[PDB]
Structures are given as C-alpha cells and as structure tokens.
Amino acid sequence: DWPVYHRIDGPIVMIGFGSIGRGTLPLIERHFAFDRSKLVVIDPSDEARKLAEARGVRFIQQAVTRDNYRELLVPLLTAGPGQGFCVNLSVDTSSLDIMELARENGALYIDTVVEPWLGFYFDPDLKPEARSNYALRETVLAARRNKPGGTTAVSCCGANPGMVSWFVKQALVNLAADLGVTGEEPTTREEWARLAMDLGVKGIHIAQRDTQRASFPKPFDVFVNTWSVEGFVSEGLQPAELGWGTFERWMPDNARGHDSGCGAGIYLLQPGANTRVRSWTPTAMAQYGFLVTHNESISIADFLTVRDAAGQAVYRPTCHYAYHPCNDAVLSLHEMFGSGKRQSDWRILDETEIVDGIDELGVLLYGHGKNAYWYGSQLSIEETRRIAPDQNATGLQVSSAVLAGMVWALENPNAGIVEADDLDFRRCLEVQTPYLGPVVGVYTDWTPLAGRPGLFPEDIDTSDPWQFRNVLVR
Amino acid sequence: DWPVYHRIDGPIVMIGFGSIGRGTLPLIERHFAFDRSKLVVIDPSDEARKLAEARGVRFIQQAVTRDNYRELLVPLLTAGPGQGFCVNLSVDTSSLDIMELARENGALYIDTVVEPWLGFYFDPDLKPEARSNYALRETVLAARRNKPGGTTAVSCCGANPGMVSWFVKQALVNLAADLGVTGEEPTTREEWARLAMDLGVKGIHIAQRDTQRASFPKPFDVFVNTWSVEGFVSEGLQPAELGWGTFERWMPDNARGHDSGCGAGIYLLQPGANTRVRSWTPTAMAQYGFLVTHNESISIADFLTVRDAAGQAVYRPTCHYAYHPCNDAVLSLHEMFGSGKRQSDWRILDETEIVDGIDELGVLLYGHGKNAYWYGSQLSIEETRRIAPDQNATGLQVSSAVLAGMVWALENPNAGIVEADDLDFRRCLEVQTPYLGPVVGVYTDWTPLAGRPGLFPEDIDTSDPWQFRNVLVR
Ligand SMILES: NC(=O)c1ccc[n+]([C@@H]2O[C@H](COP(=O)([O-])OP(=O)(O)OC[C@H]3O[C@@H](n4cnc5c(N)ncnc54)[C@H](O)[C@@H]3O)[C@@H](O)[C@H]2O)c1
Ligand SMILES: NC(=O)c1ccc[n+]([C@@H]2O[C@H](COP(=O)([O-])OP(=O)(O)OC[C@H]3O[C@@H](n4cnc5c(N)ncnc54)[C@H](O)[C@@H]3O)[C@@H](O)[C@H]2O)c1
Numbered sequence: 001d002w003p004v005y006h007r008i009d010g011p012i013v014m015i016g017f018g019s020i021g022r023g024t025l026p027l028i029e030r031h032f033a034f035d036r037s038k039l040v041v042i043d044p045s046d047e048a049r050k051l052a053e054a055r056g057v058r059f060i061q062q063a064v065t066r067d068n069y070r071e072l073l074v075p076l077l078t079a080g081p082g083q084g085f086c087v088n089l090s091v092d093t094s095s096l097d098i099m100e101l102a103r104e105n106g107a108l109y110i111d112t113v114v115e116p117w118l119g120f121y122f123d124p125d126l127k128p129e130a131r132s133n134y135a136l137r138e139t140v141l142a143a144r145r146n147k148p149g150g151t152t153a154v155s156c157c158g159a160n161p162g163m164v165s166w167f168v169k170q171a172l173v174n175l176a177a178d179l180g181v182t183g184e185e186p187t188t189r190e191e192w193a194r195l196a197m198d199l200g201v202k203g204i205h206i207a208q209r210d211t212q213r214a215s216f217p218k219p220f221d222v223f224v225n226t227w228s229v230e231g232f233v234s235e236g237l238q239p240a241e242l243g244w245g246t247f248e249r250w251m252p253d254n255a256r257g258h259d260s261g262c263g264a265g266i267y268l269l270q271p272g273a274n275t276r277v278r279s280w281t282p283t284a285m286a287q288y289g290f291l292v293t294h295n296e297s298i299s300i301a302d303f304l305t306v307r308d309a310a311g312q313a314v315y316r317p318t319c320h321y322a323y324h325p326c327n328d329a330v331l332s333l334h335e336m337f338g339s340g341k342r343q344s345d346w347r348i349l350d351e352t353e354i355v356d357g358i359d360e361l362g363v364l365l366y367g368h369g370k371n372a373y374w375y376g377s378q379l380s381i382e383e384t385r386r387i388a389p390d391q392n393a394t395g396l397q398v399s400s401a402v403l404a405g406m407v408w409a410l411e412n413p414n415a416g417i418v419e420a421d422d423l424d425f426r427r428c429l430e431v432q433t434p435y436l437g438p439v440v441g442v443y444t445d446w447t448p449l450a451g452r453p454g455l456f457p458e459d460i461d462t463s464d465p466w467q468f469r470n471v472l473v474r
Numbered sequence: 475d476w477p478v479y480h481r482i483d484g485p486i487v488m489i490g491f492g493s494i495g496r497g498t499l500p501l502i503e504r505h506f507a508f509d510r511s512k513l514v515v516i517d518p519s520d521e522a523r524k525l526a527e528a529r530g531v532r533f534i535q536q537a538v539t540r541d542n543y544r545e546l547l548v549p550l551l552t553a554g555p556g557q558g559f560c561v562n563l564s565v566d567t568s569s570l571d572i573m574e575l576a577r578e579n580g581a582l583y584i585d586t587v588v589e590p591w592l593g594f595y596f597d598p599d600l601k602p603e604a605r606s607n608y609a610l611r612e613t614v615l616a617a618r619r620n621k622p623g624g625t626t627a628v629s630c631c632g633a634n635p636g637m638v639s640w641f642v643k644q645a646l647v648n649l650a651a652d653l654g655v656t657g658e659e660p661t662t663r664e665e666w667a668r669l670a671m672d673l674g675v676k677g678i679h680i681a682q683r684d685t686q687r688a689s690f691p692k693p694f695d696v697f698v699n700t701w702s703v704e705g706f707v708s709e710g711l712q713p714a715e716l717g718w719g720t721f722e723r724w725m726p727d728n729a730r731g732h733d734s735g736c737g738a739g740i741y742l743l744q745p746g747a748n749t750r751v752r753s754w755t756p757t758a759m760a761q762y763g764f765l766v767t768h769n770e771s772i773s774i775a776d777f778l779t780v781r782d783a784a785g786q787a788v789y790r791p792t793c794h795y796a797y798h799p800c801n802d803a804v805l806s807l808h809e810m811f812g813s814g815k816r817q818s819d820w821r822i823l824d825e826t827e828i829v830d831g832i833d834e835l836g837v838l839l840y841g842h843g844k845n846a847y848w849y850g851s852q853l854s855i856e857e858t859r860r861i862a863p864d865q866n867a868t869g870l871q872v873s874s875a876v877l878a879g880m881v882w883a884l885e886n887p888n889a890g891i892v893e894a895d896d897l898d899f900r901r902c903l904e905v906q907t908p909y910l911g912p913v914v915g916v917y918t919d920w921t922p923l924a925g926r927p928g929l930f931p932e933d934i935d936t937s938d939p940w941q942f943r944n945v946l947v948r
C-alpha cells in the first residue's frame with residue numbers, strides 16, 4: 001500500500017535508462033497514476049533496450065542529439081491529453097536545451113545534473129573556467145532571467161545535487177533547536193541565509209562514504225563504480241570546484257574566480273577526482289574525500305548568501321563535495337590517473353553483485369558553536385532490496401529524490417525554473433524519507449587539524465581549524 | 475634435488491620470526507647442512523613462539539633491546555663450535571649495533587634493512603634529515619671506515635634492497651649488448667659506474683607492482699599488506715627519499731640535501747607513502763608508485779657514481795622506489811593517511827589467503843638510447859606454493875635473497891661490512907634464481923610525459939621526459 005501522489009495526465013518521456021533511470025521507473029509506476037502506454041523510455045543502448053523490453057515498457061532506441069532533439073521530443077511531449085513530464089536521466093544531452101524545449105511546450109521537466117551536449121567536456125579549445133559547473137549553472141540562471149515563471153522545471157534534483165539541499169535546511173533547523181533557539185523556521189531565502197550566518201556556519205561539506213562492495217574483486221583495467229562510470233569520470237576530470245565562503249583567508253595559487261555570475265564559486269586548475277580534502281562522516285570518521293565539482297557546491301553557497309545594501313556578499317558559506325566512493329572506485333581512480341587514461345572497460349555494480357555496504361550521504365555543517373554536525377542518510381543495500389527493485393543504495397537515494405522533485409513539480413506546476421534549494425524541503429523529504437533508511441544527525445569534535453602538525457612542517461592556520469587551507473591535501 | 479651449498483658448524487641465530495623469518499627458515503634448513511639443535515629463534519611474540527615450537531626449533535621469547543642485546547646475544551653468537559651466523563629479520567632492533575656485536579664476536583651477519591632501535595622512527599625531537607635512510611646508511615658506512623675488513627656482515631640483502639642491485643648489474647650488461655657498447659664486463663665499482671655513464675642511464679626506478687589479493691575483502695580499519703605492516707608503515711612515514719642524479723635540473727621546493735656523507739641523496743619534507751611518482755612495469759604498464767624511502771635508492775646511486783680527480787661527482791643516476799603495493803595496501807594507505815592515524819588492527823596476507831597474483835619486482839633503467847628497460851622477477855603465488863612453504867610471492871623474493879646472501883658470506887667470510895652492490899651478483903643470482911619465477915627484460919617507449927600536457931596546465935620539462943620534475947605527482 002504505497003501512496004499514489006498524483007495523476008499524470010500526459011506523456012512521461014524518460015531520457016536515459018542507465019542506473020538511475022532503471023531505479024526511477026519502478027518508483028514512477030508505483031507512485032503516480034497514469035495509463036501505462038503513456039510512458040516511453042529513450043536510450044541508445046542495447047543493454048537498456050533489453051531491460052526495458054523485459055519490464056514491458058515502450059522503448060525508443062535513439063541517442064538524443066542537438067540535431068534531432070526537437071524532432072524527437074516535441075511530438076512525444078505533446079501527445080496529450082494534458083501536461084506531460086520529461087524525466088531526463090541521461091548523459092551527453094543538454095539539460096538546458098531539453099529543459100527549454102519542455103517549457104516551451106508546456107511539459108514539466110526534471111534532471112539530476114546540468115549536462116552539456118556530447119563533445120563539450122573534452123573539447124580542447126575550452127578554457128578550464130568554461131568547463132566548470134559554475135559556468136554551466138550560469139546558463140540555467142540566465143534562462144530563468146530571460147523567461148521567469150512558466151512551467152516548472154526542476155534542475156539538479158538527484159541525491160547530490162538535490163536531496164542534500166533539503167538536508168542543509170533540516171540541519172540548520174536542528175542546529176538552532178539544539179541551541180534552544182525556538183521560533184518559526186525560515187520561509188524566505190534571505191531568512192535561510194541569515195539563519196546560517198547567525199548560527200555561525202562557516203562551511204558545509206557534502207560528506208559521502210560509499211561502502212558497497214562487490215562479490216568479485218576489482219578487475220584490472222576495468223573502472224568500477226556504483227553509479228555512472230561515464231558521468232563520474234566526466235565530473236572527476238572537470239576542475240575541482242567549490243562555493244567559496246566569506247570566512248576563508250587563503251586559497252591555493254592555482255585557484256581562480258569568475259568575472260561574472262552569482263559570485264559564489266572558485267575552481268582549481270586541477271581535476272577534482274585527483275584532489276583530496278580532509279573530511280568526516282559518522283561511519284568513516286576522519287577520511288579523505290575527493291573534491292569533485294558538483295552543482296550544489298555553488299547553489300547552496302549562493303542560496304545561503306547574505307548581501308549588504310550595495311549588493312556585496314557579507315556572508316556566504318564554503319560548500320563543496322568531499323566524496324569517498326566505494327573501494328573499487330577508489331582503486332579505479334588510482335588506476336586511471338596513474339595510467340594517464342581511461343580504462344578499456346567499465347562496469348556499474350548491480351544490487352545482485354553487491355555483498356554488503358551502505359551509501360552514507362549527508363551534509364557536514366561546521367564552524368558553529370558545536371563545531372561540526374553531520375545530517376543525512378545511511379541507507380544499506382539490504383534495506384534497499386526490500387523497499388525498491390532494480391537498484392543499489394546509491395541509486396535509490398537518487399531515484400527517490402527524482403520522485404520527490406516530480407511530486408513537488410506536479411503540486412507546484414507554475415513555478416518556473418527552480419533548483420532543489422527552491423523547493424519545499426519538508427514536502428520533498430516527506431516523499432523521499434521512506435527510501436532513505438536511517439536518517440540521523442551527529443555532532444563531532446573532529447576538525448581538519450586533528451593530529452596536526454605531525455612530523456613534517458605543514459602550512460596550517462591553527463586559529464581557524466576549518467579553513468580550506470587546513471582541509472585541502474597539499 | 476635441492477643443492478646443499480655448505481655446512482654451517484656454529485649457531486644460527488635468527489632474530490625475528492615474522493613473515494620473512496617464517497619463509498627463510500625452511501630455505502636455511504633446505505640448503506645448508508647443520509644440526510637443527512644449533513638453530514635458535516628469538517622473538518617477543520606468542521604467535522612466533524607457537525610456530526617455532528611446531529618446527530621443533532629452540533625459541534627464546536624476548537624482544538632484543540638496547541638494554542639487553544649484549545647480555546642476550548653474545549652467548550648465543552659464541553656458543554660454537556664454529557663460526558655462527560646471525561640472521562636478522564626483525565623490526566625495532568638496531569641493525570648497526572647487532573652487526574657490530576656479531577663482528578666483534580666473529581659471527582657472520584645478514585639483514586634486510588638498516589633498522590634503528592625502537593623509539594627512533596617517531597622521536598619528535600629528530601629533525602627530518604636524521605629520520606632518513608641516507609642518515610641510517612651513513613652510520614653503516616662510518617662503521618666500515620672505522621673497522622675495515624673483518625668478519626663479513628651483509629647489510630640490506632633482501633629483495634629490495636638486495637636482489638635489485640643484482641638486477642641493475644644484469645640490466646646494464648644487457649643494455650650494453652643491445653646498444654652495441656663494447657668492452658669487458660665490469661669487475662670493479664668504478665667500471666660498473668663507468669658503464670652506466672657510457673650507456674647514458676639517467677636514472678633507475680625500483681619498479682614494483684604487487685597484484686596478490688586475498689579471498690576476503692579489505693576490512694574497515696585494518697591495514698592489509700603482503701609483508702610487514704609495521705615495517706611498511708615505518709618506512710612510509712619516513713621522508714620521501716631518492717638517490718639524486720646528475721642529469722636532474724629541478725627539485726621541489728621542499729626537497730633537501732645532506733651536508734655530509736656520500737653525497738648521493740635528497741629527501742622531501744613529506745611522507746614517502748603519501749608521495750606518488752609516475753612509473754611503469756610490464757604487467758601494470760603506466761602506473762603510480764609511492765616514493766617510499768629505501769636503502770637501495772641511495773646505495774645504487776652511490777655505487778654508480780663516477781668522480782673526477784677533485785673527487786667531485788661527474789655522473790650519478792637518479793634512483794628511487796616506485797612502489798605499487800597490493801590493492802588492499804593501496805586502500806590501507808588511503809585509509810591511514812585520510813584518517814590521520816594508524817588503523818587499530820592489521821594483518822599480513824598468508825599464502826593460504828591469497829587467491830592469485832604476482833609480485834612483479836624489477837629495475838627500470840631509463841634515459842638511454844632505447845628509452846627505458848625493465849628487468850626483474852614476475853613471481854606468481856601459484857609458483858611460490860610449488861617451490862617453497864610458509865610464504866607468499868613477496869616473501870619468497872626476500873627469503874631467497876637472504877639465502878643468496880648467506881651463501882655468499884660463507885664463501886667470502888672476511889669481506890667486512892658489505893651491501894648487496896658489493897656482492898658477486900652472478901653467484902647470488904645463481905642461488906636465488908630457482909625462486910624468482912619468470913625473470914625478464916622488457917623495453918618500452920613509455921615516458922612520464924605520455925599524454926601530457928593534458929586539459930590543465932602542468933609544470934613540466936618538455937626537453938627531457940625523464941626529469942624528476944615530470945615524474946613526481948604534485
Ligand atoms: N545525485 C545526483 O544528482 C546524481 C547521481 C547519479 C547520477 N547523476 C547523473 O544522472 C545521469 C545518469 O546516471 P546513471 O548512473 O544512470 O548513468 P549511466 O551511465 O548508468 O546511464 C546513462 C544512460 O544514458 C544513456 N545515453 C547516452 N547518451 C544518450 C543520449 N544522447 N540520449 C539518451 N540517452 C543517452 C546511456 O545509454 C546510458 O544508459 C548522469 O548524467 C549522472 O551524472 C546524478
Ligand atoms: N626486500 C627487503 O629488503 C625487505 C622485505 C621485507 C621486509 N624487510 C624487512 O624485514 C623485516 C621483517 O619483515 P617481516 O615481514 O618479517 O616483518 P613482520 O612484521 O612480519 O615481523 C617482524 C618480527 O619482528 C619481531 N620483533 C619485534 N620486535 C622485536 C625485537 N625487539 N626483537 C626481536 N624481534 C622483534 C616481531 O614480533 C615480528 O615477529 C622488517 O624490518 C622489514 O622492513 C625487508
């Protein structure tokens with residue numbers, strides 16, 4: 001007896017049927033009312049076709065490209081009788097162009113990433129700045145400025161980016177309550193930003209530890225991951241990137257800012273998946289994470305910015321990813337960066353291939369009076385198998401966030417282009433929480449200066465343990 | 475059947491009965507003639523005691539310390555009737571002090587590391603220079619100058635240091651043939667150095683890839699290795715260290731030299747096991763190694779130094795370790811450095827736990843006319859189990875080098891303090907080769923600049939691919 005949240009009165013066009021599409025389709029079928037023949041999946045892969053045929057769903061074996069996307073998607077999204085929903089879970093497609101097409105035709109839209117057309121991430125004529133998620137996000141912000149309001153389109157609503165924006169709001173509320181600060185929670189963006197400022201939040205890690213492991217050892221010259229290998233390598237080869245807090249007093253020599261845009265970001269002239277940061281999760285305790293670029297690194301810092309009358313930022317948290325992937329992915333990164341090139345083969349771990357483990361994913365708020373607070377999900381593979389098919393624990397955190405964004409978009413269908421920071425976080429977490437396993441908040445007295453300095457000289461700032469100077473591995 | 479090289483008539487005193495002692499004792503029993511009652515094993519651990527008793531060998535459950543080593547060891551070393559052999563395969567004991575005791579009492583000596591007394595590797599008042607293997611080795615060189623000749627003591631005769639010195643000589647021979655350099659095979663240190671210089675060898679990696687893996691996955695908060703965890707962690711937390719070649723044109727800002735000594739070394743003010751270098755082996759192809767300090771990095775560069783009349787070095791190869799350990803040790807390093815402290819538990823993989831894999835261990839000579847040449851052993855666990863008990867492939871490469879060193883010392887018992895570079899490499903390899911599996915030379919066109927510059931600006935030296943500037947990972 002699962003809740004059916006809404007009737008969808010139009011076509012459901014799912015672009016992409018890899019690990020996330022495969023975990024999202026059963027949730028869509030479970031939680032929305034629609035005639036089954038309204039749903040069609042689009043993916044160029046033979047593997048995806050065979051799985052879709054086995055699930056009995058309509059399947060169009062085609063790559064969506066700049067040359068064909070209008071021809072293909074417009075008729076599919078406007079088949080009627082009412083408003084359709086474009087669920088974009090693909091690689092190599094332009095989120096912006098597909099979102100703008102959906103909106104022009106009155107269809108709802110959701111995705112989990114601001115993705116460019118094939119050919120972008122490895123174009124040699126591009127500067128590192130132009131390869132940054134800040135630059136991609138700015139194309140979406142400009143599209144919203146050019147066409148405000150209109151049909152709801154939800155950008156970057158997966159686990160991270162996505163759910164972690166809701167966790168930040170919940171964590172801020174909890175931090176205030178744990179101090180005895182009572183009174184209504186924020187309702188506006190400015191109020192959220194000021195809550196973070198008033199609590200003294202210096203920054204936020206998206207602090208993740210994947211402990212899922214397979215029944216076979218990592219094969220030589222095979223990249224192994226629990227979600228998209230292509231997508232992980234793409235973002236891992238983008239510049240390291242972070243939302244940049246007002247409290248930071250140091251940045252590396254190879255860090256750069258941006259001439260234009262929301263003002264919240266810096267990037268480093270080095271690949272994020274080969275950049276390490278010191279961080280912490282409840283199961284990992286102190287660990288290395290990789291400083292992989294993510295939309296929410298910028299979007300959360302932007303959302304939580306307090307400006308003065310003249311428009312300059314007076315407060316902004318640091319925000320970035322601190323990702324410890326599954327052990328086989330750690331080894332895959334060591335192998336890829338060590339060989340200088342991508343492995344000849346790759347595979348994504350299926351739930352049938354996973355022996356145990358969890359995907360621990362939350363937000364680590366630091367610098368406040370209780371030093372650091374981690375809030376998020378500790379979903380295990382064992383629980384995943386019991387509550388949702390066709391995915392591992394990493395996949396279910398993502399697919400259930402897409403579900404929640406879809407509920408929100410159907411309930412708020414005239415909201416325009418929105419990010420996860422713009423949604424009603426309580427409504428979204430109400431939809432998502434049945435799929436998140438243990439959701440817990442944990443304080444720690446760990447800081448990045450724990451145990452330091454050691455037996456070698458280090459450049460550290462002992463007056464401010466959470467300075468990026470102390471977090472970055474150098 | 476197996477050759478019995480010599481009769482040993484005196485006591486055989488084995489200090490330490492861990493992974494290497496366990497592998498070396500059966501080879502000693504196989505290849506030397508002696509009454510088993512003349513063996514004596516000294517180790518503080520109960521695990522060692524149970525193993526020794528199972529072998530029916532005399533056992534003393536003591537830790538050898540600065541306070542007790544003269545009182546404990548002299549009666550054992552001088553028990554007669556003949557000359558004794560002290561086989562030191564321990565941790566936390568002073569190689570130098572035990573070696574000098576053995577020589578003072580007419581006993582032969584062999585070890586696989588210049589180890590200091592307990593307390594040194596983590597004394598907070600030691601400057602980084604004093605923690606280097608260069609400095610430890612200089613204490614051995616000083617002892618030789620103080621007491622030339624005398625009873626043979628073989629310093630650092632394992633797989634690496636040890637065997638790889640013999641691989642360097644064989645590789646120089648092979649390169650000379652292949653490049654058409656004419657001349658007699660060297661027979662003195664000065665002739666070997668001149669051969670390296672005439673061949674244009676800019677440098678040498680001790681290039682190693684361990685692919686052994688266990689039937690169980692890496693446990694959380696357990697350091698896993700194929701040999702000493704204590705020993706590996708100790709050397710991994712010493713400064714990164716290398717023999718410094720005359721061709722190098724750049725050193726990092728945190729590199730330092732030495733005021734005194736043989737002059738062949740630099741060290742970096744960072745731990746070697748968290749320092750990566752670009753390297754290459756036949757099985758791994760291009761890979762990261764860790765720049766872990768090792769005696770042979772100095773000893774080989776020193777041995778192959780050519781000087782002019784003024785005693786100034788005019789040629790010297792760069793030489794250093796480029797270690798890719800087994801996958802579980804790679805994960806163990808990521809865990810240890812990421813948490814800032816040693817794991818609470820550790821284990822050494824036993825042959826009964828290893829499912830497959832090899833220990834590929836060789837020397838990569840580079841900068842000559844055929845770019846780079848790797849020469850070494852590709853010993854598999856399957857072959858190891860066929861030919862020797864109680865050890866894995868890593869251990870067998872070490873124990874068989876100790877065996878070769880012992881045979882050499884018996885045939886040359888009044889040669890004074892010697893390193894592996896000073897032994898007759900052909901006799902040593904004649905004893906060792908039955909235990910090395912495939913031993914092969916391979917050329918490659920790979921260089922550290924393959925694929926570079928990439929998508930981000932890099933500080934590289936395009937005039938000479940093999941510069942340390944291009945090898946070191948920043
Ligand atoms: N939390 C998050 O926000 C989050 C998490 C995971 C993944 N993602 C993103 O979601 C997307 C999918 O992840 P995944 O794990 O399912 O990836 P995946 O690699 O498993 O699958 C991607 C699918 O896209 C298909 N595809 C490729 N080119 C296409 C085209 N032109 N048109 C249509 N389909 C095409 C592929 O055939 C493949 O099946 C990725 O972009 C990834 O970066 C976001
Ligand atoms: N190729 C090489 O040159 C090479 C390779 C492997 C190991 N090694 C060195 O050989 C040594 C042994 O390696 P391992 O793998 O056998 O190590 P291990 O950790 O397995 O064993 C070390 C043994 O020494 C014993 N020990 C500790 N303190 C002692 C003391 N005070 N007196 C006597 N014994 C003591 C321990 O109880 C243990 O059994 C280490 O020093 C290691 O660095 C060299």
Ligand SMILES: N=C(N)NCCCCN
Pocket residue numbers: 189299302303415416417418419421422
């Ligand atoms: N989320 C922000 N950064 N700003 C608020 C944008 C609100 C869009 N309706």
Ligand SMILES: N=C(N)NCCCCN
Pocket residue numbers: 663773776777889890891892893895896
């Ligand atoms: N190996 C050296 N570096 N020098 C040679 C010294 C000879 C010792 N009997």
